[PDB]
Design an enzyme around this catalytic site. Structure first.
Site, PDB file in Angstrom:
ATOM      1  N   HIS A  63     -42.980  -7.022  64.578  1.00 40.62           N
ATOM      2  CA  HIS A  63     -43.947  -6.909  63.493  1.00 40.62           C
ATOM      3  C   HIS A  63     -45.327  -6.513  64.000  1.00 40.62           C
ATOM      4  CE1 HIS A  63     -44.706 -11.038  64.971  1.00 40.62           C
ATOM      5  NE2 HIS A  63     -45.951 -10.768  64.622  1.00 40.62           N
ATOM      6  N   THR A  65     -49.057  -7.487  63.033  1.00 39.41           N
ATOM      7  CA  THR A  65     -49.864  -8.423  62.257  1.00 39.41           C
ATOM      8  C   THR A  65     -51.141  -7.775  61.730  1.00 39.41           C
ATOM      9  OG1 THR A  65     -49.069 -10.338  63.527  1.00 39.41           O
ATOM     10  CG2 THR A  65     -51.136 -10.602  62.318  1.00 39.41           C
ATOM     11  N   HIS A 139     -51.218  -3.561  66.789  1.00 39.89           N
ATOM     12  CA  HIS A 139     -50.243  -3.513  67.870  1.00 39.89           C
ATOM     13  C   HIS A 139     -48.945  -4.227  67.502  1.00 39.89           C
ATOM     14  CE1 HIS A 139     -51.849  -7.588  68.400  1.00 39.89           C
ATOM     15  NE2 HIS A 139     -50.714  -7.851  69.021  1.00 39.89           N
ATOM     16  N   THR A 141     -46.329  -6.776  69.575  1.00 41.84           N
ATOM     17  CA  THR A 141     -46.099  -7.522  70.805  1.00 41.84           C
ATOM     18  C   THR A 141     -44.639  -7.443  71.233  1.00 41.84           C
ATOM     19  OG1 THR A 141     -47.898  -9.079  70.355  1.00 41.84           O
ATOM     20  CG2 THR A 141     -46.195  -9.777  71.921  1.00 41.84           C
TER      21      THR A 141
HETATM   22  N1  LIG Z   1     -56.178 -16.034  65.983  1.00 44.17           N
HETATM   23  C1  LIG Z   1     -54.739 -16.034  66.044  1.00 44.17           C
HETATM   24  N2  LIG Z   1     -54.025 -17.150  66.352  1.00 44.17           N
HETATM   25  C2  LIG Z   1     -52.637 -17.136  66.407  1.00 44.17           C
HETATM   26  N3  LIG Z   1     -51.967 -15.961  66.143  1.00 44.17           N
HETATM   27  C3  LIG Z   1     -52.695 -14.886  65.847  1.00 44.17           C
HETATM   28  C4  LIG Z   1     -54.063 -14.891  65.788  1.00 44.17           C
HETATM   29  N4  LIG Z   1     -54.559 -13.606  65.449  1.00 44.17           N
HETATM   30  C5  LIG Z   1     -53.461 -12.774  65.289  1.00 44.17           C
HETATM   31  N5  LIG Z   1     -52.306 -13.544  65.530  1.00 44.17           N
HETATM   32  C6  LIG Z   1     -50.921 -13.123  65.478  1.00 44.17           C
HETATM   33  O1  LIG Z   1     -50.251 -13.839  64.496  1.00 44.17           O
HETATM   34  C7  LIG Z   1     -48.903 -13.912  64.824  1.00 44.17           C
HETATM   35  C8  LIG Z   1     -48.467 -15.329  64.932  1.00 44.17           C
HETATM   36  O2  LIG Z   1     -49.229 -15.926  65.915  1.00 44.17           O
HETATM   37  C9  LIG Z   1     -48.740 -13.213  66.107  1.00 44.17           C
HETATM   38  O3  LIG Z   1     -48.317 -11.907  65.857  1.00 44.17           O
HETATM   39  C10 LIG Z   1     -50.100 -13.235  66.703  1.00 44.17           C
HETATM   40  O4  LIG Z   1     -50.377 -12.030  67.281  1.00 44.17           O
HETATM   41  P1  LIG Z   1     -49.951 -11.526  68.679  1.00 44.17           P
HETATM   42  O5  LIG Z   1     -51.160 -10.903  69.362  1.00 44.17           O
HETATM   43  O6  LIG Z   1     -48.874 -10.511  68.517  1.00 44.17           O
HETATM   44  S1  LIG Z   1     -49.272 -13.042  69.748  1.00 44.17           S
END
Ligand SMILES: Nc1ncnc2c1ncn2[C@@H]1O[C@H](CO)[C@@H](O)[C@H]1OP(=O)(O)S
Length: 208
Positions: A63, A65, A139, A141
Site C-alpha cells: 500500500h 499511505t 512511497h 514500503t
Molecule cells: N507518523 C506515523 N506513525 C506510524 N505510521 C505512520 C506514520 N506516518 C505514516 N505512517 C504509515 O502508516 C502505516 C501504518 O504505520 C505505515 O504505512 C506507515 O508508513 P511506512 O513509512 O510505510 S512504515
C-alpha cells in the site's frame, strides 16, 4: 464514528505480487553487486543477504499511505477524513507510478510519483520535505531492519530526494536490468527505473 488507522492506496493482488518480486530481485542484485559489497562498512558496523536484512516486510497487500490517523488520535486526522475529495475518492481505483527503488540501512521501498488528482488526497499538515514538492514522500514500503519504526521509509526517501536535489547523486555505479544504480553514500542506494512501473490500487481506509 472513529477513523481508520490510516488512509491509503492499496495495490491489487496482481500489482502487489509484481512490486514485491521486483523489490525482491532488486535486493538480491544489489547485494550481489560489487559496488555495494565494497561499501558494506558504510551500511552496517559489524556478504550481506539484503532480503534477510530487511526481515520485517508487509505480510500481504502492499500500500501507499496518505494520512496516518491512529483512529483519530493523530493530529489533523479528523480534518483529513472530513474532506470531500477523500470521502468521494473512497473505494475508487487509481494507477500509481513507481519511479525508483531505494535502500538504506533502515528501510527498503519504492518511490511513488503522484498525479495532481492523486495529490488532492495527500495530507497538508517536516524539515526534510522542505524544498521538495508536496507528496515527494509518497512511497511503498518493501521492508525494514529489525529495530526500525513506522514512518521511517518516508523519512528515508525524503533524505534521498534531498541528495538528488543538490545534484549529488553521482554517476551511476552500475546498470541493472531495470535501470541505473546510484550510490548516494551513507548506505543509501537508488535504482532509477528505465520504465516506470504502474500499479493499480484502491483508495480506502485500514482499521487494523
Ligand atoms: N507518523 C506515523 N506513525 C506510524 N505510521 C505512520 C506514520 N506516518 C505514516 N505512517 C504509515 O502508516 C502505516 C501504518 O504505520 C505505515 O504505512 C506507515 O508508513 P511506512 O513509512 O510505510 S512504515
Amino acid at each position: 464514528d472513529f477513523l481508520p488507522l490510516y488512509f491509503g492506496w492499496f495495490l491489487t493482488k496482481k500489482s502487489s505480487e509484481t512490486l514485491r518480486k521486483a523489490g525482491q530481485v532488486f535486493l538480491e542484485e544489489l547485494g550481489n553487486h560489487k559496488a555495494f559489497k565494497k561499501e558494506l562498512r558504510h551500511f552496517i558496523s559489524g556478504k550481506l543477504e539484503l532480503v534477510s536484512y530487511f526481515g520485517k516486510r508487509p505480510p500481504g497487500v502492499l500500500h501507499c499511505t496518505t494520512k496516518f490517523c491512529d483512529y483519530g488520535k493523530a493530529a489533523g486526522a479528523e480534518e483529513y477524513a472530513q474532506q470531500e475529495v477523500v470521502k468521494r475518492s473512497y473505494g475508487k481505483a487509481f494507477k500509481l507510478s513507481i519511479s525508483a527503488l531505494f535502500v538504506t540501512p533502515k528501510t527498503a521501498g519504492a518511490q511513488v510519483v503522484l498525479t495532481d488528482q492523486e495529490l488532492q488526497l495527500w495530507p497538508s499538515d517536516p524539515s526534510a520535505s522542505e524544498g521538495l514538492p508536496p507528496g515527494s514522500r509518497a512511497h511503498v514500503t518493501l521492508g525494514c531492519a529489525a529495530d526500525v519504526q513506522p514512518a521511517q521509509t518516508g523519512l528515508d526517501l525524503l533524505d534521498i530526494l534531498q541528495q538528488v536535489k543538490g545534484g549529488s547523486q553521482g554517476e551511476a555505479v552500475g546498470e541493472l536490468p531495470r535501470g541505473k544504480l546510484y550510490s548516494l553514500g551513507k548506505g543509501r542506494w537508488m535504482l532509477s527505473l528505465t520504465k516506470k512501473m504502474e500499479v493499480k490500487a484502491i483508495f480506502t481506509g485500514y482499521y487494523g
